[PDB]
Design an enzyme around this catalytic site. Structure first.
Site, PDB file in Angstrom:
ATOM      1  N   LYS A 102       0.652  -1.362   0.315  1.00  0.00           N
ATOM      2  CA  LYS A 102      -0.359  -0.269   0.072  1.00  0.00           C
ATOM      3  C   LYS A 102       0.889   1.265  -0.063  1.00  0.00           C
ATOM      4  CE  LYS A 102      -4.305  -2.258   2.035  1.00  0.00           C
ATOM      5  NZ  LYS A 102      -4.277  -3.402   1.448  1.00  0.00           N
ATOM      6  N   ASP A 132      -7.939  14.388  31.712  1.00  0.00           N
ATOM      7  CA  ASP A 132      -7.848  13.264  32.321  1.00  0.00           C
ATOM      8  C   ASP A 132      -7.458  13.650  33.887  1.00  0.00           C
ATOM      9  OD1 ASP A 132      -8.601  11.378  29.837  1.00  0.00           O
ATOM     10  OD2 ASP A 132      -7.171  12.367  29.116  1.00  0.00           O
TER      11      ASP A 132
HETATM   12  N1  LIG Z   1      -8.486   6.414  24.033  1.00  0.00           N
HETATM   13  C1  LIG Z   1      -8.072   5.118  24.684  1.00  0.00           C
HETATM   14  N2  LIG Z   1      -7.180   5.486  25.726  1.00  0.00           N
HETATM   15  C2  LIG Z   1      -6.576   4.378  26.586  1.00  0.00           C
HETATM   16  C3  LIG Z   1      -6.702   3.114  25.437  1.00  0.00           C
HETATM   17  N3  LIG Z   1      -5.860   2.135  26.199  1.00  0.00           N
HETATM   18  C4  LIG Z   1      -5.898   3.010  27.330  1.00  0.00           C
HETATM   19  O1  LIG Z   1      -4.588   2.113  28.232  1.00  0.00           O
HETATM   20  N4  LIG Z   1      -5.239   3.923  27.379  1.00  0.00           N
HETATM   21  C5  LIG Z   1      -5.197   5.046  28.454  1.00  0.00           C
HETATM   22  C6  LIG Z   1      -4.059   5.408  27.739  1.00  0.00           C
HETATM   23  C7  LIG Z   1      -4.798   6.782  27.548  1.00  0.00           C
HETATM   24  O2  LIG Z   1      -3.418   8.046  27.028  1.00  0.00           O
HETATM   25  C8  LIG Z   1      -5.661   7.186  28.439  1.00  0.00           C
HETATM   26  C9  LIG Z   1      -6.485   8.590  28.306  1.00  0.00           C
HETATM   27  O3  LIG Z   1      -7.058   8.424  26.849  1.00  0.00           O
HETATM   28  P1  LIG Z   1      -7.687   9.272  26.221  1.00  0.00           P
HETATM   29  O4  LIG Z   1      -8.181   8.869  24.691  1.00  0.00           O
HETATM   30  O5  LIG Z   1      -7.701  10.884  26.526  1.00  0.00           O
HETATM   31  O6  LIG Z   1      -5.767   9.963  25.454  1.00  0.00           O
HETATM   32  P2  LIG Z   1      -4.581  11.058  25.353  1.00  0.00           P
HETATM   33  O7  LIG Z   1      -4.606  12.079  26.693  1.00  0.00           O
HETATM   34  O8  LIG Z   1      -3.036  10.363  25.270  1.00  0.00           O
HETATM   35  O9  LIG Z   1      -5.219  11.542  24.106  1.00  0.00           O
HETATM   36  P3  LIG Z   1      -6.060  13.008  23.876  1.00  0.00           P
HETATM   37  O10 LIG Z   1      -7.277  13.540  24.340  1.00  0.00           O
HETATM   38  O11 LIG Z   1      -4.965  14.279  23.593  1.00  0.00           O
HETATM   39  O12 LIG Z   1      -6.217  12.396  22.477  1.00  0.00           O
HETATM   40  O13 LIG Z   1      -5.958   6.464  28.689  1.00  0.00           O
HETATM   41  C10 LIG Z   1      -7.607   2.961  24.737  1.00  0.00           C
HETATM   42  O14 LIG Z   1      -7.520   2.350  23.943  1.00  0.00           O
HETATM   43  N5  LIG Z   1      -8.088   3.535  23.954  1.00  0.00           N
HETATM   44 CA   LIG Z   2     -10.015  11.296  28.518  1.00  0.00          CA
HETATM   45 CA   LIG Z   3      -7.214  13.427  27.117  1.00  0.00          CA
END
Ligand SMILES: Nc1nc2c([nH]c(=O)n2[C@H]2C[C@H](O)[C@@H](COP(=O)(O)OP(=O)(O)OP(=O)(O)O)O2)c(=O)[nH]1
Ligand SMILES: [Ca+2]
Ligand SMILES: [Ca+2]
Ligand code: NA
Ligand code: NA
Length: 326
Positions: free
Chosen positions: A63, A183
């Site tokens: 790809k 978070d």
């Molecule tokens: N979304 C998500 N988070 C996960 C998964 N598995 C896992 O351990 N987590 C943990 C690590 C992520 O950093 C944490 C918080 O999720 P998040 O969606 O708010 O991700 P983030 O803060 O890293 O990124 P972002 O909000 O800037 O998009 O949850 C998964 O499958 N999906």
């Molecule tokens: Ca989150």
């Molecule tokens: Ca987040």
DNA sequence: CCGACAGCGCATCAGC
DNA sequence: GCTGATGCGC
DNA sequence: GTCGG
């Protein structure tokens, strides 16, 4: 972003496999390949070059060869022209609507934002709030706003009980200049792996944040996890800030380091790290790291006094939060 | 060739 | 009401 | 879809 075109292509394929095909392992495979390419410090010249990287196989290398030659991928060009795939892909962008609900809605003839907006009574609570703030949840949060949100959360928590400790994790803790959402890891000495000396520990904090109009909506809530919506206060004659997603996780206090490791992510980093853990004869979750016995059964929780202790067990050199953005 | 792919909280539902 | 599967989320 | 054994 040396390889932006390639990683975008792979992410789009991942999303198709997750939302449309419902092939979770193909989704993870595509995301793993995208992640490893994203960190590769050279502009990729060929599929063979890419195939040297763990996670990039024969099919992906092919790809990549198509993409580099023509600037597009026929497979994706088709998926884009498919009405059912396009609709399912759209509907899953609403929080609370997954692959199953999306396909079901398309079946019932609900397939646009307008369709959802006149069929609220067909949505569950989570979905209805997801629709309500569809646009707002698309927006990212500048670190400056994340800092203001941090202040509010930490100060309001302290006013409930000065023994609470609230830690903002996720991409914020990894030092990102913008975050998808907030978070918060919460601890209190009354809640440990050995006992819960006090009820409503999470509830009291949620209630307080609702009281000051910081938390505006609830998507789901239990004894240890809150998922909802929040909003910064705005000034006189100021346009309101967008509503933001907030997750709060109450973790046993003696298990903070496993908790913060988990909540710091990234998601792909966590999958990689836990995967490596298994390869090394351990299992890691947000609570503990345990040895896997010959039986395959997880043994007892090992001593942990730092995030680094967890890395040590699996023979990984410690990586600061800012280097876990996979 | 093929078994395994990270781990878990809350909401919803079918069966009893 | 409870239990286990499933959906969807982190 | 990719990889280890
Ligand atoms: N979304 C998500 N988070 C996960 C998964 N598995 C896992 O351990 N987590 C943990 C690590 C992520 O950093 C944490 C918080 O999720 P998040 O969606 O708010 O991700 P983030 O803060 O890293 O990124 P972002 O909000 O800037 O998009 O949850 C998964 O499958 N999906
Ligand atoms: Ca989150
Ligand atoms: Ca987040
Ligand atoms: Na490879
Ligand atoms: Na969704």
């Amino acid at each position: 972003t040396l390889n932006g075109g390639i990683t975008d292509m792979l992410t789009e394929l991942a999303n198709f496999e997750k939302n449309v095909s419902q092939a979770i392992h193909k989704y993870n495979a595509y995301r793993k390949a995208a992640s490893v390419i994203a960190k590769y410090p050279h502009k990729i010249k060929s599929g063979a070059e890419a195939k040297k990287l763990p996670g990039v196989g024969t099919k992906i290398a092919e790809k990549i060869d198509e993409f580099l030659a023509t600037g597009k991928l026929r497979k994706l060009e088709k998926i884009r022209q498919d009405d059912t795939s396009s609709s399912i892909n759209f509907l899953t962008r609403v929080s609370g609507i997954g692959p199953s609900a999306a396909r079901k809605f398309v079946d019932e003839g609900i397939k646009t934002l307008e369709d959802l907006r006149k069929n609220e009574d067909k949505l569950n609570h989570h979905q209805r709030i997801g629709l309500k703030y569809f646009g707002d949840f698309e927006k990212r949060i500048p670190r400056e706003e994340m800092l203001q949100m941090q202040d509010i959360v930490l100060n309001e928590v302290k006013k409930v009980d000065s023994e609470y400790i609230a830690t903002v994790c996720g991409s914020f803790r990894r030092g990102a200049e913008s975050s998808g959402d907030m978070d918060v890891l919460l601890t209190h000495p009354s809640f440990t792996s050995e006992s819960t000396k006090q009820p409503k520990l999470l509830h009291q904090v949620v209630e307080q944040l609702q009281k000051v109009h910081f938390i505006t909506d609830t998507l789901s809530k239990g004894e240890t996890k809150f998922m909802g919506v929040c909003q910064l206060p705005s000034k006189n004659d100021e346009k309101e800030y967008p509503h933001r997603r907030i997750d709060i996780r109450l973790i046993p206090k003696d298990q903070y380091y496993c908790g913060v490791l988990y909540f710091t992510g990234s998601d792909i980093f966590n999958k990689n790290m836990r995967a490596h853990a298994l390869e090394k004869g351990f299992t890691i979750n947000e609570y503990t790291i345990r040895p896997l016995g010959v039986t395959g059964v997880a043994g007892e929780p090992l001593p942990v006094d730092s995030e680094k202790d967890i890395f040590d067990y699996i023979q990984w050199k410690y990586r600061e939060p800012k280097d876990r953005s996979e």
